[PDB]
Design an enzyme around this catalytic site. Sequence first.
Site, PDB file in Angstrom:
ATOM      1  CG  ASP A  12      12.437  -8.341  -0.346  1.00 15.62           C
ATOM      2  OD1 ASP A  12      11.564  -9.227  -0.248  1.00 15.62           O
ATOM      3  OD2 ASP A  12      12.315  -7.326  -1.064  1.00 15.62           O
ATOM      4  CB  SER A  64       5.963  -4.221   3.097  1.00 23.37           C
ATOM      5  OG  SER A  64       5.173  -3.951   1.954  1.00 23.37           O
ATOM      6  CG  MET A  65       1.212  -0.145   4.478  1.00 25.37           C
ATOM      7  SD  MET A  65       2.543   0.525   5.486  1.00 25.37           S
ATOM      8  CE  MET A  65       1.626   1.414   6.730  1.00 25.37           C
ATOM      9  N   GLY A 116       0.826  -1.190   0.000  1.00 23.94           N
ATOM     10  CA  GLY A 116       0.000   0.000   0.000  1.00 23.94           C
ATOM     11  C   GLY A 116       0.862   1.241   0.000  1.00 23.94           C
ATOM     12  CG  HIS A 125      11.055  -4.494   2.174  1.00 22.44           C
ATOM     13  ND1 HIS A 125      12.385  -4.769   2.388  1.00 22.44           N
ATOM     14  CD2 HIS A 125      11.002  -3.732   1.058  1.00 22.44           C
ATOM     15  CE1 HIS A 125      13.108  -4.190   1.449  1.00 22.44           C
ATOM     16  NE2 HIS A 125      12.294  -3.556   0.627  1.00 22.44           N
TER      17      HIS A 125
END
Lengths: 133, 165, 148, 187, 174, 179, 233, 172, 217
Positions: free
Chosen positions: F153, F79-80, F50, F104
């Site tokens: 990652d 990551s979001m 996002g 991340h």
Amino acid sequence: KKVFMIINSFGGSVGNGITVHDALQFIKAGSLTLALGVAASAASLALAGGTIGERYVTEGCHTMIHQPEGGLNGQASDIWIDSQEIMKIRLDVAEIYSLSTYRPRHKILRDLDRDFYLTAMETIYYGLADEIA
Amino acid sequence: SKKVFMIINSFGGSVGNGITVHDALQFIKAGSLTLALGVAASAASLALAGGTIGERYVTEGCHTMIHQPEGGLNGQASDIWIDSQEIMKIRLDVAEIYSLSTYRPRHKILRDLDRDFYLTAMETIYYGLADEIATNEVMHSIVEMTNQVWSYHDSKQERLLESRA
Amino acid sequence: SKKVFMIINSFGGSVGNGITVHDALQFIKAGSLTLALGVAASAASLALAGGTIGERYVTEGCHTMIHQPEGGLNGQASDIWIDSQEIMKIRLDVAEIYSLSTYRPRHKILRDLDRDFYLTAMETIYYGLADEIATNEVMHSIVEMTNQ
Amino acid sequence: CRPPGQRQSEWVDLWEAYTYQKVVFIKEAITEDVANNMIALTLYLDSLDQKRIYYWLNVPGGDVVPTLALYDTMQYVRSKTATVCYGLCLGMGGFLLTAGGEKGYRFAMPHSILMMHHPSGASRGQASEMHIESRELVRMRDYLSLLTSNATGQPYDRVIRELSRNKWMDPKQAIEYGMIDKVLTTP
Amino acid sequence: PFGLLLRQRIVFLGGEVEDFGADAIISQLLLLDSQDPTKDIKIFINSPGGSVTAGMGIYDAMMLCRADVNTYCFGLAASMGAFLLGAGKRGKRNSMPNSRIMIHQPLGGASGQAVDIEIQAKEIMYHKANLNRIMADYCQQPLSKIEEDTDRDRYMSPLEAKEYGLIDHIIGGE
Amino acid sequence: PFGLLLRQRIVFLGGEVEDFGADAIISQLLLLDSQDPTKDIKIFINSPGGSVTAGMGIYDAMMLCRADVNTYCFGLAASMGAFLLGAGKRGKRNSMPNSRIMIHQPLGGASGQAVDIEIQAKEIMYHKANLNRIMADYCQQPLSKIEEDTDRDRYMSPLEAKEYGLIDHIIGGEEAVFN
Amino acid sequence: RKLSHLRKKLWKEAGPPPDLATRLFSERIMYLGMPIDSSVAELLTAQLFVLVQEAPDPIFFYINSTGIAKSTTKFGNEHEAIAVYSMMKGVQKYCPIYTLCVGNAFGEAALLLSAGSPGKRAALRSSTIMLRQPLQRLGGMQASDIDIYRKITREKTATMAKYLAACTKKTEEQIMTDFTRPRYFNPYEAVSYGLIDTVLEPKEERAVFKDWEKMGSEIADLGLWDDEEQPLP
Amino acid sequence: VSQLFQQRIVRLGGAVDDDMANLLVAQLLYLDSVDNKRDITMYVNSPGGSVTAGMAVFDTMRHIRPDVSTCCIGLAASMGAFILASGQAGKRYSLPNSRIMIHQPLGGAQGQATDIEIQANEILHHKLTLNGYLAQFTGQSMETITKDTDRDFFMSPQEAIEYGLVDAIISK
Amino acid sequence: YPEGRPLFLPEAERFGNPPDLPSLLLQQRVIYISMPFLPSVTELVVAQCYYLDFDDRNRQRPIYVYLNSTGCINDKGQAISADNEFYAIWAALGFTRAPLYTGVTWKAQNQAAVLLSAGQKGHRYSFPHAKISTAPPVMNRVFGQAVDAQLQANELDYATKYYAAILARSTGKDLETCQKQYLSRKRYFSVKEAYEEGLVDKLVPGFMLNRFRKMQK
């Protein structure tokens, strides 16, 4: 000493065929025209433009003959004028074919109407070519 | 002789390329006459500054431009930081060049870099990018200099054409 | 120059071209010294294996990747079928050519063309596609032959 | 039509070989590019000496300002000018066919197709900008009509009424109309 | 939200005037004339202008309405929203204090050749004459300075335009 | 069907999270709070990422809610979504046995005069610090370790995350947790 | 010295070459015939340097240019015209430069028309010499450019006015008041203003008067409401 | 949006344009027609917008009768930030993690020296008007605000509290 | 028919200067690599090397390799070509005899930085504002199973160890150290930082700044 024109042209604008026909007739020493494979309209005119007695076609070659094409755009009177010239072009092409085939010009106009295909022997008989390779 | 002649009329170009041409002009051991005609953006201005002092001419209607490089970055956060360090170090490189070509304070030159700064012929002399305004008599003198320098090769060519003819 | 030196560095090309170069190199009377610089992909691997046996050189840093023919084809079910059979016949042609160039059996070559297959200098010489590491003296002499 | 034809001693390109004999083949519709090339060629040919320049035209149309520039260059040069029509001359090409050699030196091939029409143009902007452009284009129509009328000998008012639409002519109609002077034949 | 204002007799002439939008506004003004020949019709304007054909059609519709027509300016009225902004009743033309009003002369389209360009240039001279005439009529200004100012695109603040004559009130006095 | 689930105080956050998507979810959470203050909300997160701005908008909405806001990740949380899943109430964050959780940093860029480039680098560096600070608090792990991990990652299984402090329960009793 | 060797270059080097550009450069003719641009300016500077170096013999300059471009296509800069103009002014004291306008000379090229050696500067009678509205169709800047932009465009427009007064011997106030709308002179008006020194009438003239188109009929009767017939000439 | 709209919620979301401004203005005028007393709240999330549309929205906000409280969600950038700063005094809220940006106007121009100079001084007019209004809304002087708007000024919600754009934070 | 032998500078000084510029530089034994390591540059450089070691009498006249290329990786950090183009160039430049001097004009990046280091010790030149940078090798996007990506990882690790070997030989450091410092992350070097680490050795000979010349006048 004689322009020897090898012809193999699947198409082209008919007016360019007329222009090449005129260029052919312009030089005085005769022109030999040997068609290979295909001679469509703009090149059928060129093939008919060689020296009568010295125009040759090959057993595999096919001759296309058809009336000219055109797109028009504009007001009604512009369309009328442009139609009148395309008719003048078609009449001229029929006249050239009549000069080369010695056949009724109205009959040649009737044959131009739609796409017209001639085998090598029918090219000889029609009059566009004289002999077979 | 072998003093290079650069004719400069360029409205743009990457700043790094201007720095490269500046240094290239620098390592040539003979002189270097650089004449700017009409315009010289950042890259071409760096090229102009690189001529021999006493031979950086600018024409009356010529407008040089001191400004910092325009860039664009795409990558991770560390990539963003390292590439912005690229660009800042390039700004300091250009400030160094403009000081070692103008004697202006590197603070003032960096400010001039911050907002794109155009200069006309007299002011371009004033800052130190060029030495002489190329007015018509200056331009006459320049084409005379080209005459004298090219005439050695011309005489060589004369004798060769005499032989061949 | 009674030898034709052919220097290889190419990332691909249709396999039919590799076959053509392999056949031509095997047809001419004169010998052939094929040197690989950097890479030799499918067609280039065929051209590298095509030189005179014993003079197919490969540098220390060269890679040789051999993969089965890949094709693309559209049309009716019978047309897909016929083109499929032809592509399999090409895969067998390539396997047999590698088998005869390297002396490995066609079944171990076919097993390897199942997937893209990278080989180093030692791996390539062991496998049989090349015959000697290219040291500086090799084409020292090659240039000297072209000059002498 | 590429092959270089042999010249006095070497192989030279067909169109350069032609211009070595003062012959200037114009074969494309007159855009800025072709017009500049032909203006340059005319000026240099007049520079070499002053004998005469034959223009063989196959022009199917073109733009108005470049054609008038070419016309004015033809009139400016010392050496006279003759225009032949191989193929066809349409619009501004039919105006160039009436640009060289008023005294009986315009020829045409027997099946050449000739057409003249009032020059076109298109431009927009403010209201006053359109006024300026429209006035200039009317000036252009009038100038090209004066030139056509004094070339062919037809009344100016007749030309204005005739060329408002397309006008097409066979070489016999072009002789009768005064557009050309002779039709080439086998001689 | 617009329809819920169209029951309160409000029309939004927002965005560039084009054939479809102007046709919609003409239709709405016919409808509002139909509903009540007396109640006020308010038109909110926010536009960089558009076609002079469509704008003149909207003007005709606005002066067909037997009801009163108020005009309010939001932000940008430029070259045809200014023309239709001044077209409200004398004494009922308003703008926001921070709205910009810019006056301009019409623009035309392109079809054909020099005779057709003559035809279009005659059209656009007529349109410029008509816009200058009407605009110098409701601003109570001589044609000389209207011809002068329209030919130069110059944005005007609402107090400046109010001194000019386009608008009668500024909402807030600012 | 989402109407019945929204009646049951279940909010779905699925697919890419964006500015408008955020505004919609923010509004749903505010509605569920203003209607009923004592009954928990469940937010389901299947989202590959996002915008940091929109994500922090949804996170602020989640932290405003008086009614404890549980989260239940399924499939991806990249990551979001993973940050928002870690922003549920402690002890009431759940995941499927085979969801994939990614932590991340964000991407970015800038252009033109490098003044805006330095400002964008400063803003991307702010996003890094802001996200990591709250991540460290709820994961209950040293900020240095979180800063190092948010660089790398990598996906993790809900077992690894449950060890790492992000989620607290796995729906399935760790009987279908496959590596 | 170098006269015989222009001859020898003609004998061995400059006769054979095919390119029309090469033949023209052999004839010391520089045809500016295209929207003047950066490439064109560098070419003209190279040509003019070499043409000086050949001999103090004169140069012919034919100008058929539509300005830096047409108003319907992206413009370039005004600095190409200034570059070429300054090169020409520097050259002229050592080499005559006849400058002749065939066709058109719009705006920037008009400067290049007026920059020929005085008394050797001509345009055809059927040409147009436009001092067009100033300038810059480039519109790709932002507001962050406003603080520089004014100090450019004036910086360009005023520079041109100055150069034009150094070619027409006029007052720059007039040139500034004339820029505001594109004002394009006839050759005779141009000689009056000073842009060119002569006008090249053709050897023969063709176009005659068309005033025989005028009607000249009587004024309309006061009792004849004319219909709406909108005609064409 | 309707689901929010009946809650007297007006969304200024995404970069402003003239269509978005038309929608905002219609919503605000309808909502003032419904009830002139009870408050309007308005969520701000926008990276910019045309200056004229923002000015239209700002004037519509000003002269209507209900107070338009502005709550920033996510971001407010230099034209949505001015709109956010223009909510009713004491009722300009921010979310705790939102960011606030102020920077100068933007836009291009093309035409003669005269026309593009006119565009230049209208951009100067926009800049002057925005600085004056920001000085009215924050309390800082023209000089500090002009320096701030001169270069990209990213700010945190708290700083905006002591710099005057916002009145409070919703940590509540 | 007759074998036409290319004659070289000692005996070709009597045939004049070459017509254009690249022929000039080839005659001066300068191989100017101005364009990224595409297959075209590789072919051209291999042919230049083959011509230069073809008939040099002494083949001690050094070969100059000036670099203005970002190597095998595009400006935006995504590989534009492969590492095998570098190997082919490098291998080619090794099959000659002459000392290989290298220099940087503006940018020697990501592969050209290694090739820069790979010149003669004491004879690596740069312009004083050249930007040097070392980044890990990059592959281009290919599709497949986990096995295909594993194969690519193996290939990229061969490439990384290759570059680390060359950089260890050039900069005189531990092999794994050179892997960690340079190839592990995209790092930038000014001319002074690059000189500090052995990347470059000198400025181009004769480089003298303008105001410095002025103040020595």
